[PDB]
Design a binder for these strands. Structure first.
Ligand SMILES: [K+]
Ligand SMILES: [K+]
Ligand SMILES: [K+]
Ligand SMILES: [K+]
Ligand SMILES: [K+]
Ligand SMILES: [K+]
Ligand SMILES: [K+]
Ligand SMILES: [K+]
Ligand SMILES: [K+]
Ligand SMILES: [K+]
Ligand SMILES: [K+]
Ligand SMILES: [K+]
Ligand SMILES: [K+]
Ligand SMILES: [K+]
Ligand SMILES: [K+]
Ligand SMILES: [K+]
Ligand SMILES: [Mg+2]
Ligand SMILES: [Mg+2]
Ligand SMILES: [Mg+2]
Ligand SMILES: [Mg+2]
Ligand SMILES: [Mg+2]
Ligand SMILES: [Mg+2]
Ligand SMILES: [Mg+2]
Ligand SMILES: [Mg+2]
Ligand SMILES: [Mg+2]
Ligand SMILES: [Mg+2]
Ligand SMILES: [Mg+2]
Ligand SMILES: [Mg+2]
Ligand SMILES: [Mg+2]
Ligand SMILES: [Mg+2]
Ligand SMILES: [Mg+2]
Ligand SMILES: [Mg+2]
Ligand SMILES: [Mg+2]
Ligand SMILES: [Mg+2]
Ligand SMILES: [Mg+2]
Ligand SMILES: [Mg+2]
Ligand SMILES: [Mg+2]
Ligand SMILES: [Mg+2]
Ligand SMILES: [Mg+2]
Ligand SMILES: [Mg+2]
Ligand SMILES: [Mg+2]
Ligand SMILES: [Mg+2]
Ligand SMILES: [Mg+2]
Ligand SMILES: [Mg+2]
Ligand SMILES: [Mg+2]
Ligand SMILES: [Mg+2]
Ligand SMILES: [Mg+2]
Ligand SMILES: [Mg+2]
Ligand SMILES: [Mg+2]
Ligand SMILES: [Mg+2]
Ligand SMILES: [Mg+2]
Ligand SMILES: [Mg+2]
Ligand SMILES: [Mg+2]
Ligand SMILES: [Mg+2]
Ligand SMILES: [Mg+2]
Ligand SMILES: [Mg+2]
Ligand SMILES: [Mg+2]
Ligand SMILES: [Mg+2]
Ligand SMILES: [Mg+2]
Ligand SMILES: [Mg+2]
Ligand SMILES: [Mg+2]
Ligand SMILES: [Mg+2]
Ligand SMILES: [Mg+2]
Ligand SMILES: [Mg+2]
Ligand SMILES: [Mg+2]
Ligand SMILES: [Mg+2]
Ligand SMILES: [Mg+2]
Ligand SMILES: [Mg+2]
Ligand SMILES: [Mg+2]
Ligand SMILES: [Mg+2]
Ligand SMILES: [Mg+2]
Ligand SMILES: [Mg+2]
Ligand SMILES: [Mg+2]
Ligand SMILES: [Mg+2]
Ligand SMILES: [Mg+2]
Ligand SMILES: [Mg+2]
Ligand SMILES: [Mg+2]
Ligand SMILES: [Mg+2]
Ligand SMILES: [Mg+2]
Ligand SMILES: [Mg+2]
Ligand SMILES: [Mg+2]
Ligand SMILES: [Mg+2]
Ligand SMILES: [Mg+2]
Ligand SMILES: [Mg+2]
Ligand SMILES: [Mg+2]
Ligand SMILES: [Mg+2]
Ligand SMILES: [Mg+2]
Ligand SMILES: [Mg+2]
Ligand SMILES: [Mg+2]
Ligand SMILES: [Mg+2]
Ligand SMILES: [Mg+2]
Ligand SMILES: [Mg+2]
Ligand SMILES: [Mg+2]
Ligand SMILES: [Mg+2]
Ligand SMILES: [Mg+2]
Ligand SMILES: [Mg+2]
Ligand SMILES: [Mg+2]
Ligand SMILES: [Mg+2]
Ligand SMILES: [Mg+2]
Ligand SMILES: [Mg+2]
Ligand SMILES: [Mg+2]
Ligand SMILES: [Mg+2]
Ligand SMILES: [Mg+2]
Ligand SMILES: [Mg+2]
Ligand SMILES: [Mg+2]
Ligand SMILES: [Mg+2]
Ligand SMILES: [Mg+2]
Ligand SMILES: [Mg+2]
Ligand SMILES: [Mg+2]
Ligand SMILES: [Mg+2]
Ligand SMILES: [Mg+2]
Ligand SMILES: [Mg+2]
Ligand SMILES: [Mg+2]
Ligand SMILES: [Mg+2]
Ligand SMILES: [Mg+2]
Ligand SMILES: [Mg+2]
Ligand SMILES: [Mg+2]
Ligand SMILES: [Mg+2]
Ligand SMILES: [Mg+2]
Ligand SMILES: [Mg+2]
Ligand SMILES: [Mg+2]
Ligand SMILES: [Mg+2]
Ligand SMILES: [Mg+2]
Ligand SMILES: [Mg+2]
Ligand SMILES: [Mg+2]
Ligand SMILES: [Mg+2]
Ligand SMILES: [Mg+2]
Ligand SMILES: [Mg+2]
Ligand SMILES: [Mg+2]
Ligand SMILES: [Mg+2]
Ligand SMILES: [Mg+2]
Ligand SMILES: [Mg+2]
Ligand SMILES: [Mg+2]
Ligand SMILES: [Mg+2]
Ligand SMILES: [Mg+2]
Ligand SMILES: [Mg+2]
Ligand SMILES: [Mg+2]
Ligand SMILES: [Mg+2]
Ligand SMILES: [Mg+2]
Ligand SMILES: [Mg+2]
Ligand SMILES: [Mg+2]
Ligand SMILES: [Mg+2]
Ligand SMILES: [Mg+2]
Ligand SMILES: [Mg+2]
Ligand SMILES: [Mg+2]
Ligand SMILES: [Mg+2]
Ligand SMILES: [Mg+2]
Ligand SMILES: [Mg+2]
Ligand SMILES: [Mg+2]
Ligand SMILES: [Mg+2]
Ligand SMILES: [Mg+2]
Ligand SMILES: [Mg+2]
Ligand SMILES: [Mg+2]
Ligand SMILES: [Mg+2]
Ligand SMILES: [Mg+2]
Ligand SMILES: [Mg+2]
Ligand SMILES: [Mg+2]
Ligand SMILES: [Mg+2]
Ligand SMILES: [Mg+2]
Ligand SMILES: [Mg+2]
Ligand SMILES: [Mg+2]
Ligand SMILES: [Mg+2]
Ligand SMILES: [Mg+2]
Ligand SMILES: [Mg+2]
Ligand SMILES: [Mg+2]
Ligand SMILES: [Mg+2]
Ligand SMILES: [Mg+2]
Ligand SMILES: [Mg+2]
Ligand SMILES: [Mg+2]
Ligand SMILES: [Mg+2]
Ligand SMILES: [Mg+2]
Ligand SMILES: [Mg+2]
Ligand SMILES: [Mg+2]
Ligand SMILES: [Mg+2]
Ligand SMILES: [Mg+2]
Ligand SMILES: [Mg+2]
Ligand SMILES: [Mg+2]
Ligand SMILES: [Mg+2]
Ligand SMILES: [Mg+2]
Ligand SMILES: [Mg+2]
Ligand SMILES: [Mg+2]
Ligand SMILES: [Mg+2]
Ligand SMILES: [Mg+2]
Ligand SMILES: [Mg+2]
Ligand SMILES: [Mg+2]
Ligand SMILES: [Mg+2]
Ligand SMILES: [Mg+2]
Ligand SMILES: [Mg+2]
Ligand SMILES: [Mg+2]
Ligand SMILES: [Mg+2]
Ligand SMILES: [Mg+2]
Ligand SMILES: [Mg+2]
Ligand SMILES: [Mg+2]
Ligand SMILES: [Mg+2]
Ligand SMILES: [Mg+2]
Ligand SMILES: [Mg+2]
Ligand SMILES: [Mg+2]
Ligand SMILES: [Mg+2]
Ligand SMILES: [Mg+2]
Ligand SMILES: [Mg+2]
Ligand SMILES: [Mg+2]
Ligand SMILES: [Mg+2]
Ligand SMILES: [Mg+2]
Ligand SMILES: [Mg+2]
Ligand SMILES: [Mg+2]
Ligand SMILES: [Mg+2]
Ligand SMILES: [Mg+2]
Ligand SMILES: [Mg+2]
Ligand SMILES: [Mg+2]
Ligand SMILES: [Mg+2]
Ligand SMILES: [Mg+2]
Ligand SMILES: [Mg+2]
Ligand SMILES: [Mg+2]
Ligand SMILES: [Mg+2]
Ligand SMILES: [Mg+2]
Ligand SMILES: [Mg+2]
Ligand SMILES: [Mg+2]
Ligand SMILES: [Mg+2]
Ligand SMILES: [Mg+2]
Ligand SMILES: [Mg+2]
Ligand SMILES: [Mg+2]
Ligand SMILES: [Mg+2]
Ligand SMILES: [Mg+2]
Ligand SMILES: [Mg+2]
Ligand SMILES: [Mg+2]
Ligand SMILES: [Mg+2]
Ligand SMILES: [Mg+2]
Ligand SMILES: [Mg+2]
Ligand SMILES: [Mg+2]
Ligand SMILES: [Mg+2]
Ligand SMILES: [Mg+2]
Ligand SMILES: [Mg+2]
Ligand SMILES: [Mg+2]
Ligand SMILES: [Mg+2]
Ligand SMILES: [Mg+2]
Ligand SMILES: [Mg+2]
Ligand SMILES: [Mg+2]
Ligand SMILES: [Mg+2]
Ligand SMILES: [Mg+2]
Ligand SMILES: [Mg+2]
Ligand SMILES: [Mg+2]
Ligand SMILES: [Mg+2]
Ligand SMILES: [Mg+2]
Ligand SMILES: [Mg+2]
Ligand SMILES: [Mg+2]
Ligand SMILES: [Mg+2]
Lengths: 141, 77, 153, 110
RNA sequence: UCCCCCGUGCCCAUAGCGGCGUGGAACCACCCGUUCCCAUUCCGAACACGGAAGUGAAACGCGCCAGCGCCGAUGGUACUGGGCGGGCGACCGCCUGGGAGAGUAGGUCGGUGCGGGGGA
RNA sequence: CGAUCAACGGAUAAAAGUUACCCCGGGGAUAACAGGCUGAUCUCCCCCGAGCGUCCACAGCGGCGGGGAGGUUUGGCACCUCGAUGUCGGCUCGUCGCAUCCUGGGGCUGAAGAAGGUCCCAAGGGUUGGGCUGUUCGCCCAUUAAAGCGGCACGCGAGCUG
RNA sequence: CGCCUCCUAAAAGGUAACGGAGGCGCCCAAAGGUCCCCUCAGGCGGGACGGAAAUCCGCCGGAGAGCGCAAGGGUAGAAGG
RNA sequence: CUGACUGGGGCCUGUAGAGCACUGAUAGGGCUAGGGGGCCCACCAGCCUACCAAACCCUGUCAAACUCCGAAGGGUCCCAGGUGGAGCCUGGGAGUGAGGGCGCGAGCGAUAACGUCCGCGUCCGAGCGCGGGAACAACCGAGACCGCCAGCUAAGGCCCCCAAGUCUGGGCUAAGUGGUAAAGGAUGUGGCGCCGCGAAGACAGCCAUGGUCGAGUGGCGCCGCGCCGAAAAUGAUCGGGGCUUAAGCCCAGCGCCGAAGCUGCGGGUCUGGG
């Protein structure tokens, strides 16, 4: 499971999920990528669930690129406590993902293997996704 | 938490007090700042807390000199 | 070895053009700068095989067949579609641009300056735990390396 | 980068220009010595004297004293009395000191 | 009015780093000494003075070079003042006015004022 | 000059507890019950298919993750009620929902038969007596076709009990 | 529970929560005035004891050092030695 | 005449966005100070690593307390328009110092609450007066001095309840969808595309790649409107009746109905000017 090794600040404010993706919008490392279609907080558990599913489906071969990282701390108050008395404790980490962001790539596999592995990985994620392949537009960037 | 945090200090109301083209009298405070964000130009003095004040009656003029800094002048009438 | 029809535009709103299935763009070099537009499906079919490497000849309604190169494609992040195209107009001077690579990972377009008349199409490289640098390129006659000498490919 | 010479020149002259007077600027080469009276507000030179133009030859400290007298005599005909002495990178001593006393003996207020 | 040098400004890298060439007639510098004025937490290195045997090697000035650095359009986009809509929500569209950052083409090995010395 | 007048615009030079023996003025400006909004918690249903199942992902199962429904639990909030909305269990009397415990009808089965497992349809009728404990709950005894789960101010004290 | 710094704070100022992070209740007789002089951290190479790191020499290095104590602003054309 | 508001001009700012120059975070690869073992060998070192990892190089990202950048706006001054139950000065009299909903920008909360805490605006409060929204403080329309059996409009409507079109033209839906929900699933349906194979006789059927077969057919993409997914407790229902080339949805027209808004006619009253 991913998380930053060091942090300047333990807790962050809940920001905003506005706008299309800032960076990471084109396939850059692999041959087939999974692209987000709507914004969400993607937790570290969901990232690992998707990665392991591709590893199992890629028996022997395959190399997987994870292009998102959960750097944002996620906070929760303990059960049965009232409002107030400070911000809740850190319970996990999420990655802020906006539409157009390429989340995963794969390489070293056939086309059939890539489409099935990325399809299963998407079922582990809380958002609608699409599968893309590297094209001239990605190389033009 | 609600025990570790909870402190702050009063706001200081810093910034430029008179802008370019305004007519000022001698002694008028022109800038409140921490350090030399603006530098004293012609007919401008600096106090011990980097406050810029006019030395003569006149018109405020702002100037940017690149690597030499930003200057505030008072041009006499 | 590619052709495409381009139409001049003056003041039509680019959002209006895109709703009509068109693609706003610009063409320029150190002498000219003209606003144009092209048909979106026609450009897409050419660009998938003619990337920033190959020359595209634009047919204008003024009777001039200008040989251009794509310098920039601006994509619509949400819809993964091109919203603007920059066309660099070729001339007699040498030009730096990205030629394709032929393998038989790190890069897919090695940058070299070259004349328009000696643009090469294939750069074949023969491929455990090692690495391939750009220093091992064949470098056919007519080009000069426009990258760092120690780039890994 | 700056040298001790360049830092010294700036440090002395920035103090002088703060006062808003006319600055008496002195340049001292291995051979000669030169003096200008400068108005920084307009950026023009009012009067200038040197041992090169006057063809003064002798002991350098003696030469510099006569250059100060000539600059002082030149200054008063133009209605200047009050100036500020700008030593630049030079210590107030020797040839530069001799020029200052010569200017003061000629009727300059500094 | 032309050119070279010396001093002092302004604009504040389009002015810079780096590479190559060049200048001693004049100026400037290095240089020769340390009795004298003055000086080194030791040292004439620095600061200072007295000079003219030598040299433009160093420094400085002046030229050429776009490798780096800096400047940088047009076009399009993001965002947005105002006016209207959609979506269970996260959020998203349309009209009207404004409009980046990055990237591209490209530009740049400064510009200019005052004074002084010399030559044409 | 004498200030942890630090509860730092500093009631006196000088000051702690307890009340189920309690009292008055007020508040639904504010808690405990019930309702309400919400649904983290709770119950149920789906998606994905790693893997189990002699062989075989899907007879029966479903790692890691994902999407919902319900409004029975524990909470969050403090919106009507503090010039009063009686609060557990039992008794009596019911009535409704179906996510069905039995009885009726079906598909599949890793269904020979008999007996089961699982899902679909189905709310007409039914769903026992007793020991322990104030208990709800639960355990136990003897049975049964079966000994269902919930709502109705956790139904029901101007109906009883206490 | 008073005071200082940053964020929240929506590019003037101001702006709340038992919101997110840290400090203060001193000190200095020079750590004050003025005049004069000087310029860092770091890296690379060389040098008895001597090293990761003492003191010495050369080169690059524009502020990444320092400025009594938090943080921010400022600052070598000094506010630093 | 100085006001809110507006026009021109200058100056001030570090948010949105963006970026990686600083401070932190961070993915893949290359090169390697130093690590784990290692062929070892302590006489002495290189080397092996499909195990880490400093700097550096390439590619690729993140930030309320990061910034090489940087808007739209906002603030302020000067000049100009602005005569308004505008502004400024002096004094008398207060009340208020429990707010609330909605929209946008944030924090807290679980990106829950008819939740809580601020900022900018708005309305209710005090407009529980009026029209629409079935009913309904704050959603839409609109600021009620009085009278009229006059007229035009607003939001919203024009099949009946119920005032006005069973109006006109083009298209879609078959689910009573319209008239209450997601991931996911599907030869529903209509419209457009990209490709493939086709009397170099194809897909299906039939005898086994060959004959039989004689006009098309197969694979993907997008769009509109629908279907399943979909279980709660007194009696049901879109407000009701009812509605299917609609009385549903989408596009375009003309007309009408519709308020205490506006106009017409008459009257009262406040302020200012003749
Ligand atoms: K998904
Ligand atoms: K107090
Ligand atoms: K008692
Ligand atoms: K009750
Ligand atoms: K379900
Ligand atoms: K009560
Ligand atoms: K019951
Ligand atoms: K059965
Ligand atoms: K039944
Ligand atoms: K019990
Ligand atoms: K006026
Ligand atoms: K960075
Ligand atoms: K303005
Ligand atoms: K309000
Ligand atoms: K369809
Ligand atoms: K009247
Ligand atoms: Mg928040
Ligand atoms: Mg967020
Ligand atoms: Mg980027
Ligand atoms: Mg949270
Ligand atoms: Mg809190
Ligand atoms: Mg929390
Ligand atoms: Mg994103
Ligand atoms: Mg703290
Ligand atoms: Mg404290
Ligand atoms: Mg605060
Ligand atoms: Mg304050
Ligand atoms: Mg403050
Ligand atoms: Mg300011
Ligand atoms: Mg001071
Ligand atoms: Mg001086
Ligand atoms: Mg010079
Ligand atoms: Mg610049
Ligand atoms: Mg001696
Ligand atoms: Mg030289
Ligand atoms: Mg362009
Ligand atoms: Mg541009
Ligand atoms: Mg532009
Ligand atoms: Mg906007
Ligand atoms: Mg707009
Ligand atoms: Mg805004
Ligand atoms: Mg706007
Ligand atoms: Mg615009
Ligand atoms: Mg831009
Ligand atoms: Mg730009
Ligand atoms: Mg240059
Ligand atoms: Mg006292
Ligand atoms: Mg007290
Ligand atoms: Mg105390
Ligand atoms: Mg005290
Ligand atoms: Mg107190
Ligand atoms: Mg006080
Ligand atoms: Mg106080
Ligand atoms: Mg106070
Ligand atoms: Mg007391
Ligand atoms: Mg007292
Ligand atoms: Mg006492
Ligand atoms: Mg007491
Ligand atoms: Mg007592
Ligand atoms: Mg008590
Ligand atoms: Mg007692
Ligand atoms: Mg008691
Ligand atoms: Mg008792
Ligand atoms: Mg007792
Ligand atoms: Mg008693
Ligand atoms: Mg007693
Ligand atoms: Mg009593
Ligand atoms: Mg009492
Ligand atoms: Mg009492
Ligand atoms: Mg009482
Ligand atoms: Mg009472
Ligand atoms: Mg009261
Ligand atoms: Mg209440
Ligand atoms: Mg109240
Ligand atoms: Mg209370
Ligand atoms: Mg309560
Ligand atoms: Mg209660
Ligand atoms: Mg209560
Ligand atoms: Mg309670
Ligand atoms: Mg309650
Ligand atoms: Mg009630
Ligand atoms: Mg629910
Ligand atoms: Mg839950
Ligand atoms: Mg649950
Ligand atoms: Mg399944
Ligand atoms: Mg198996
Ligand atoms: Mg099987
Ligand atoms: Mg869910
Ligand atoms: Mg459901
Ligand atoms: Mg639910
Ligand atoms: Mg309930
Ligand atoms: Mg409750
Ligand atoms: Mg509570
Ligand atoms: Mg409340
Ligand atoms: Mg409240
Ligand atoms: Mg009563
Ligand atoms: Mg009563
Ligand atoms: Mg009561
Ligand atoms: Mg009662
Ligand atoms: Mg009771
Ligand atoms: Mg009871
Ligand atoms: Mg009982
Ligand atoms: Mg009971
Ligand atoms: Mg009972
Ligand atoms: Mg009973
Ligand atoms: Mg009984
Ligand atoms: Mg009972
Ligand atoms: Mg009974
Ligand atoms: Mg009974
Ligand atoms: Mg029942
Ligand atoms: Mg059923
Ligand atoms: Mg049965
Ligand atoms: Mg049966
Ligand atoms: Mg059987
Ligand atoms: Mg079944
Ligand atoms: Mg069935
Ligand atoms: Mg069933
Ligand atoms: Mg049933
Ligand atoms: Mg029923
Ligand atoms: Mg039923
Ligand atoms: Mg019995
Ligand atoms: Mg029993
Ligand atoms: Mg018995
Ligand atoms: Mg029993
Ligand atoms: Mg017994
Ligand atoms: Mg018995
Ligand atoms: Mg019993
Ligand atoms: Mg019992
Ligand atoms: Mg008993
Ligand atoms: Mg038990
Ligand atoms: Mg039995
Ligand atoms: Mg039994
Ligand atoms: Mg039986
Ligand atoms: Mg109920
Ligand atoms: Mg109840
Ligand atoms: Mg109860
Ligand atoms: Mg009960
Ligand atoms: Mg009950
Ligand atoms: Mg009850
Ligand atoms: Mg009961
Ligand atoms: Mg009862
Ligand atoms: Mg009861
Ligand atoms: Mg009773
Ligand atoms: Mg009872
Ligand atoms: Mg009763
Ligand atoms: Mg009663
Ligand atoms: Mg009763
Ligand atoms: Mg009883
Ligand atoms: Mg009782
Ligand atoms: Mg009792
Ligand atoms: Mg009793
Ligand atoms: Mg206090
Ligand atoms: Mg205090
Ligand atoms: Mg603001
Ligand atoms: Mg400002
Ligand atoms: Mg501010
Ligand atoms: Mg407040
Ligand atoms: Mg407040
Ligand atoms: Mg507190
Ligand atoms: Mg606070
Ligand atoms: Mg701090
Ligand atoms: Mg402290
Ligand atoms: Mg303090
Ligand atoms: Mg002291
Ligand atoms: Mg000090
Ligand atoms: Mg000091
Ligand atoms: Mg520093
Ligand atoms: Mg400290
Ligand atoms: Mg500082
Ligand atoms: Mg500094
Ligand atoms: Mg310096
Ligand atoms: Mg941002
Ligand atoms: Mg930027
Ligand atoms: Mg990060
Ligand atoms: Mg790396
Ligand atoms: Mg970023
Ligand atoms: Mg952000
Ligand atoms: Mg960012
Ligand atoms: Mg900051
Ligand atoms: Mg920022
Ligand atoms: Mg006016
Ligand atoms: Mg007044
Ligand atoms: Mg009165
Ligand atoms: Mg009064
Ligand atoms: Mg009164
Ligand atoms: Mg009052
Ligand atoms: Mg009051
Ligand atoms: Mg008050
Ligand atoms: Mg109060
Ligand atoms: Mg209050
Ligand atoms: Mg209240
Ligand atoms: Mg309140
Ligand atoms: Mg209000
Ligand atoms: Mg408030
Ligand atoms: Mg609303
Ligand atoms: Mg609201
Ligand atoms: Mg609101
Ligand atoms: Mg809102
Ligand atoms: Mg908001
Ligand atoms: Mg906030
Ligand atoms: Mg909020
Ligand atoms: Mg969210
Ligand atoms: Mg809310
Ligand atoms: Mg309400
Ligand atoms: Mg509220
Ligand atoms: Mg605030
Ligand atoms: Mg507010
Ligand atoms: Mg406010
Ligand atoms: Mg608000
Ligand atoms: Mg208001
Ligand atoms: Mg209002
Ligand atoms: Mg209001
Ligand atoms: Mg109203
Ligand atoms: Mg009002
Ligand atoms: Mg109303
Ligand atoms: Mg009302
Ligand atoms: Mg009412
Ligand atoms: Mg009311
Ligand atoms: Mg309406
Ligand atoms: Mg109404
Ligand atoms: Mg109504
Ligand atoms: Mg109705
Ligand atoms: Mg309604
Ligand atoms: Mg209403
Ligand atoms: Mg009403
Ligand atoms: Mg309203
Ligand atoms: Mg009205
Ligand atoms: Mg009337
Ligand atoms: Mg009409
Ligand atoms: Mg109309
Ligand atoms: Mg209207
Ligand atoms: Mg009618
Ligand atoms: Mg009709
Ligand atoms: Mg339909
Ligand atoms: Mg149906
Ligand atoms: Mg349906
Ligand atoms: Mg229906
Ligand atoms: Mg329906
Ligand atoms: Mg559906
Ligand atoms: Mg359905
Ligand atoms: Mg259905
Ligand atoms: Mg239900
Ligand atoms: Mg029709
Ligand atoms: Mg009317
Ligand atoms: Mg009216
Ligand atoms: Mg009238």
């Amino acid at each position: 499971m991913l998380m930053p090794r060091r942090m300047k600040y333990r807790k962050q404010q809940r920001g905003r999920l506005k706008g299309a993706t800032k960076g990471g919008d084109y396939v850059a490392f692999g041959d087939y990528g999974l692209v987000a279609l709507e914004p969400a907080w993607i937790t570290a558990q969901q990232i690992e669930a998707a990665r392991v599913a591709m590893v199992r489906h890629f028996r022997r071969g395959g190399k997987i690129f994870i292009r998102i990282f959960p750097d944002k701390p996620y906070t929760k108050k303990p059960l049965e406590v009232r409002m107030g008395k400070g911000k809740g404790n850190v319970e996990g980490y999420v990655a802020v993902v906006k539409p157009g962001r390429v989340m995963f790539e794969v390489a070293g596999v056939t086309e059939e293997q890539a489409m099935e592995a990325l399809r299963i990985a998407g079922h582990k994620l809380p958002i609608k996704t699409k599968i893309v392949r590297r094209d001239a537009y990605d190389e033009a960037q | 938490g609600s025990t570790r945090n909870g402190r702050d200090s009063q706001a200081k109301r810093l910034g430029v007090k008179r802008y370019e083209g305004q007519v000022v009298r001698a002694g008028n405070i022109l800038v409140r700042q921490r350090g030399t964000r603006f530098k004293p130009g012609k007919n401008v003095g600096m106090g011990r807390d980097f406050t810029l004040f006019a030395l003569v009656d006149g018109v405020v003029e702002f100037q940017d000199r690149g690597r030499l800094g930003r200057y505030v002048h008072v041009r006499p009438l | 070895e590619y052709r495409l029809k381009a139409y001049y535009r003056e003041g039509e709103k680019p959002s209006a053009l895109r709703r009509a299935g068109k693609l706003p763009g610009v063409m320029y070099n150190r002498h000219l700068n003209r606003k144009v537009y092209v048909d979106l499906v026609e450009f897409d079919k050419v660009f998938r095989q003619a990337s920033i490497h190959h020359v595209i000849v634009l047919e204008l309604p003024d009777g001039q067949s200008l040989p251009t190169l794509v310098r920039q494609v601006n994509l619509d992040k949400r819809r993964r579609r091109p919203e603007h195209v920059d066309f660099f107009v070729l001339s007699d001077e040498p030009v730096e641009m990205y030629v394709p690579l032929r393998f038989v990972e790190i890069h897919r377009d090695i940058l070299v300056k070259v004349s328009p008349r000696n643009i090469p199409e294939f750069i074949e490289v023969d491929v455990i735990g090692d690495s391939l640098h750009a220093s091992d390129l064949k470098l056919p006659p007519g080009v000069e390396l426009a990258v760092s000498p120690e780039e890994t490919i | 980068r700056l040298t001790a010479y360049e830092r010294r020149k700036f440090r002395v002259r920035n103090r002088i220009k703060r006062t808003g007077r006319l600055r008496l600027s002195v340049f001292r080469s291995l051979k000669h010595i030169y003096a200008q009276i400068i108005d920084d507000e307009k950026g023009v030179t009012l009067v200038s004297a040197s041992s090169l133009a006057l063809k003064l030859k002798g002991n350098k400290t003696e030469v510099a004293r006569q250059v100060g007298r000539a600059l002082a005599e030149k200054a008063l005909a133009l209605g200047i009395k009050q100036v500020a002495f700008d030593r630049g990178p030079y210590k107030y001593h020797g040839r530069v000191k001799a020029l200052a006393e010569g200017a003061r003996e000629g009727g300059l207020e500094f």
